[PDB]
Design a protein around this ligand. Sequence first.
Ligand SMILES: *[C@@H]1O[C@H](CO)[C@@H](O[C@@H]2O[C@H](CO)[C@@H](O)[C@H](O)[C@H]2NC(C)=O)[C@H](O)[C@H]1NC(C)=O
Ligand SMILES: *[C@@H]1O[C@H](CO)[C@@H](O[C@@H]2O[C@H](CO)[C@@H](O)[C@H](O)[C@H]2NC(C)=O)[C@H](O)[C@H]1NC(C)=O
Ligand SMILES: *[C@@H]1O[C@H](CO)[C@@H](O[C@@H]2O[C@H](CO)[C@@H](O)[C@H](O)[C@H]2NC(C)=O)[C@H](O)[C@H]1NC(C)=O
Ligand code: NAG
Lengths: 97, 185, 99, 100
Amino acid sequence: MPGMFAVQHVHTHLNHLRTMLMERRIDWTYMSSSWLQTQLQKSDDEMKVIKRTARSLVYYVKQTYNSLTATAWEIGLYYELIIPRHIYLNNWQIVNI
Amino acid sequence: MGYALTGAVQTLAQISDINDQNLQQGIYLLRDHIVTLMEATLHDISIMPGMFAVQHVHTHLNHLRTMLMERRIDWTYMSSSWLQTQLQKSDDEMKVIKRTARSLVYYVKQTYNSLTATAWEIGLYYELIIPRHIYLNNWQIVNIHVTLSHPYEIINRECSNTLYLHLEECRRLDYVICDVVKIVQ
Amino acid sequence: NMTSIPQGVFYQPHPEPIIHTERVLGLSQVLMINSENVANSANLSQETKALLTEMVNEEMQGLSDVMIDFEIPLGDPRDQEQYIHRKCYQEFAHCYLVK
Amino acid sequence: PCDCPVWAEPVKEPHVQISPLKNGSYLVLASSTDCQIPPYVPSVVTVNETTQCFGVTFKKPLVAEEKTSLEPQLPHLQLRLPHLVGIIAKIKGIKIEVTS
Ligand SMILES: *[C@@H]1O[C@H](CO)[C@@H](O[C@@H]2O[C@H](CO)[C@@H](O)[C@H](O)[C@H]2NC(C)=O)[C@H](O)[C@H]1NC(C)=O
Ligand SMILES: *[C@@H]1O[C@H](CO)[C@@H](O[C@@H]2O[C@H](CO)[C@@H](O)[C@H](O)[C@H]2NC(C)=O)[C@H](O)[C@H]1NC(C)=O
Ligand SMILES: *[C@@H]1O[C@H](CO)[C@@H](O[C@@H]2O[C@H](CO)[C@@H](O)[C@H](O)[C@H]2NC(C)=O)[C@H](O)[C@H]1NC(C)=O
Ligand SMILES: *[C@@H]1O[C@H](CO)[C@@H](O)[C@H](O)[C@H]1NC(C)=O
């Protein structure tokens, strides 16, 4: 990606990350799905339900190197994944008359 | 795996039958689907040369995702004029209808896979709630050992007219929508 | 200054508007995305298309991975006449044979 | 499914309990014997012609294609009849437990 295009790409992606972290949700572009799937040895539907109901948190953002040309930043992220034991899809709610 | 919604459903056939005087509250469906092409919805894909084009697509596609994660409808793929003419509603009615609309994704399928060309299909199910009585200005009642109890929980005041409204079985969205409202003296 | 609230009831503002429910409509839309069609208009180079296809597949996999399927009781969208025309035109519109 | 307690409450007659549904039926609780409804038994009703019963207009549904259902066929059991305990209900009116 030559010329100015590159920076645009970065900007877009960075913006997306922000739109994730404001809503307490995990952006999986920085977490390979294959690695976690192989480590946990779960099914595709289990992976879907695990990733859908996952929340994130930011606990420190630090600026290390500051200059007029080069900058570096570090971000800490804490996740929480809930594995299932019994999933129920079809269900009916009871009213009493 | 796959969930389901069970039970027989009534269907309106042609779309302009929503506004009648012989049908009551419920969930109503359309007989036929609406087929849409992404390349036909965008009015500015052409006249963008070189690499620029792909950037455009990426941006728009990203926006769509930012919609579908929040259970909301992106109207870039649904012409507003068509729906407005079919329903014959007012501008404010259109605004309140579009604001409180929710969407759902029920299948994403990959048909053609290759190193150069790919094709995808997405199914979307919407739900639009048309209004019957909209109330903008309203006041909430608090009661302040004798404690006289009351049936009304909301009060309306507009155009030098005062009404008392009682609510029950009410769901919460960006706005407040509910089904059982009776005017009580 | 002391005022008596009449009849034992006081009132506070509630900014949220109220809507009374009527017949609730629902419609189904099938959206089809083809990379080849947008590639032709852009006069797009081969390597750039090789980049574009991967860019599209990443987002499509990300979207499809985080959602489970449901069942809309409408029926099969295959038998629709409009879908047939659209599906033929998306891929097979400009092909011909000469003998 | 039910070992489950019971507690009831009395009300000043008459009361009309009508609950519309979302498929073209109605729920009626009969505190009296009026119109066309069996007494003292709540039920679900679907009408044929547009009528007006119990202070509410009625409209007929439209033909719907039959589909497979996942309905919860519920079991069956009766309750205790004697009215003497019900006298206690007339005393206070607060829902008080009667063992079952
Ligand atoms: C950035 O610059 C490097 C080197 O200046 C480029 O790498 C070479 O690019 C040329 C084409 O300009 C190729 O012919 C070479 O094979 C590449 N490698 C080497 C070792 O010379 C790189 O392509 C540039 N990146 C761009 C333009 O996006
Ligand atoms: C993509 O290519 C087509 C044809 O190669 C372009 O269509 C012609 O563009 C030229 C200018 O380059 C115009 O003078 C012609 O009038 C156009 N039409 C025809 C039939 O030749 C099209 O403009 C290109 N799209 C771009 C560059 O974004
Ligand atoms: C609307 O729903 C009611 C409630 O189910 C239907 O009435 C019967 O309900 C019982 C148990 O709920 C089922 O076993 C019956 O099969 C239902 N009747 C029929 C004819 O199937 C009612 O039929 C539904 N449709 C309407 C009122 O049009
Ligand atoms: C409120 O108090 C002011 C004095 O500060 C007085 O002038 C005014 O009349 C009072 N308002 C009433 C009694 O309604």
